[PDB]
Design a protein around this nucleic acid. Structure first.
Ligand SMILES: [Mg+2]
Length: 476
RNA sequence: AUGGGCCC
RNA sequence: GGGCCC
């Protein structure tokens, strides 16, 4: 988006500047060029002459403004994709009762009780359980007024900025581009789920190529489904965006809300309204207070679904701007926020589509950086989705999600205080698809110290998950 | 460190 | 309550 006023207020918000990630026994062996993100502005590992506040907000390179013809095309693409969307899901997108938004429904999980509450609650020294009691599922006095203050449409707020204590490649760590988190107020998350929660739950359960969404998908079972679909098309593309969320232009966000969440399809009038509050946000970061126009806050309700919807609309908009006679039938795709896979039997020139994406403020790039161009003839066994490759299991011929060994080495090389044993359990379910030799090698530093599940136990569990008949048939 | 997922 | 993905 576009930063419009950086302000210095007397009050200051504290930011976590101490990594909980510590090296493990595996770090000494694997020597990964990965490390914890720089949280302090006086971090020794930073390259000299790098201010952390400067690098963080560098993702806002302006807010692209569209012409009326570009907006009328985007409005048609939003209306066409919304027609397909609400035709698969149905139009049962009525509001949600107050405690349905808290305890969830079929497809939508419950809210997290012990996560940061946002502003202005955090500035009092307040946990989230004080405002909303989650055991019963009711709100307290502060949220009482805000809920109906949102109904009045008077509700103003601000996003609390947070540093993401995660593992990053050492080039990004020394460059100081630590990723941030825009924490919205808890009452805003509650009210958003009331307006569009039933829509989100219906998307979760209906994920797949038909709606172009992979949100709420389980790669262990869903990759035989996705893999066989994209293996049916001549050309496959692995497109990468740069700052996909920050570069959503105001016009594209506003037009998408006006077309997807219409009261025609069953939503409440405030569904369009509450989503439009995300366009022009105020952000608090210690002394600073930053007003921004455009971009999506990375930390709000339905932020993955909104990004997934925009991603689907961007492809339809770009193709129609360059070619003639293009519909949703022309191509197939599936996305999970910025991550996207596209395919078509037509010979689509994606190099030619780069400027048409640039009119939306987005910059597309081939994930396979070699040659530095979108070539044709790639298959599903070339591309990556959700940090996993589509490889066919040699034993049962099913597609399985395989992660690169150096990605698993980075994951295994760091861990928080005493969370190692169950992290080894969780990661082993990911490492099983790298094969028996690679699985034993990834956990060799740990054996004799921790419990390591057998490759046999995890492979059998996966066979039953992808298809319980596959386990039974192998028995007869 | 958030929103939402998926596994335990 | 922990891990992983976006
Ligand atoms: Mg990608």
């Amino acid at each position: 988006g576009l930063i419009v006023d950086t302000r210095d207020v007397e009050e200051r918000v504290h930011v976590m500047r101490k990594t909980k990630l510590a090296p493990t026994v595996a770090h000494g062996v694997f020597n990964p060029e990965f490390g914890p993100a720089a949280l302090s502005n006086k971090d020794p590992r930073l390259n000299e002459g790098v201010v952390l506040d400067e690098v963080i907000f560098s993702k806002h390179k302006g807010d692209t403004k569209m012409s009326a013809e570009d907006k009328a095309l985007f409005r048609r693409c939003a209306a066409d994709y919304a027609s397909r969307l609400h035709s698969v899901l149905g139009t049962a997108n009525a509001p949600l009762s107050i405690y349905e938004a808290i305890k969830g429904v079929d497809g939508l999980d419950a809210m997290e009780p012990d996560t940061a509450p946002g502003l202005p609650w955090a500035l009092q020294g307040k946990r989230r359980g004080a405002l909303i009691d989650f055991e019963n599922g009711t709100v307290g006095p502060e949220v009482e007024a805000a809920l109906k203050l949102m109904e009045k449409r008077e509700y103003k707020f601000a996003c609390q900025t947070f540093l993401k204590d995660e593992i990053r490649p050492m080039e990004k760590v020394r460059a100081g581009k630590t990723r941030i988190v825009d924490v919205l107020p808890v009452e805003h998350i509650l009210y958003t789920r009331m307006m569009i929660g039933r829509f989100c739950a219906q998307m979760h359960s209906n994920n797949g190529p038909q709606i172009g969404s992979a949100v709420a998908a389980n790669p262990d079972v869903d990759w035989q489904r996705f893999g066989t679909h994209f293996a049916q098309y001549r050309n496959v593309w692995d497109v990468d965006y740069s700052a996909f969320d920050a570069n959503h232009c105001s016009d594209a966000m506003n037009i998408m809300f006006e077309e997807v969440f219409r009261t025609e399809f069953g939503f409440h009038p405030n569904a369009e309204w509450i989503l439009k509050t995300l366009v022009n946000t105020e952000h608090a970061y210690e002394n600073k207070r930053i007003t921004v126009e455009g971009g999506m806050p990375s930390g709000c309700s339905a932020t993955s679904i909104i990004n997934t919807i925009l991603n689907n609309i961007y492809v339809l908009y770009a193709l129609r701007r360059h070619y003639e006679g293009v519909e949703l039938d022309t191509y197939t795709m599936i996305s999970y926020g910025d991550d996207i896979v596209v395919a078509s039997d037509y010979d689509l020139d994606f190099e030619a589509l780069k400027p048409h994406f640039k009119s939306l403020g987005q910059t597309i790039t081939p994930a396979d950086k070699s040659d530095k161009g979108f070539v044709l003839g790639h298959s599903i066994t070339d591309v990556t989705f959700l940090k996993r490759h589509f490889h066919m299991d040699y034993g049962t011929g099913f597609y399985k999600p395989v992660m690169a060994s150096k990605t698993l080495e980075a994951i295994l090389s760091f861990a928080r205080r005493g969370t190692i044993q169950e992290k080894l359990i969780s990661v082993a379910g990911l490492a099983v698809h790298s094969g028996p030799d690679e699985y034993r090698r990834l956990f060799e530093p740990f054996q004799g110290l921790f419990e390591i599940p057998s490759y046999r136990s995890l492979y059998l569990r996966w066979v039953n998950a992808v298809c319980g008949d596959a386990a039974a048939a192998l028995e007869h």
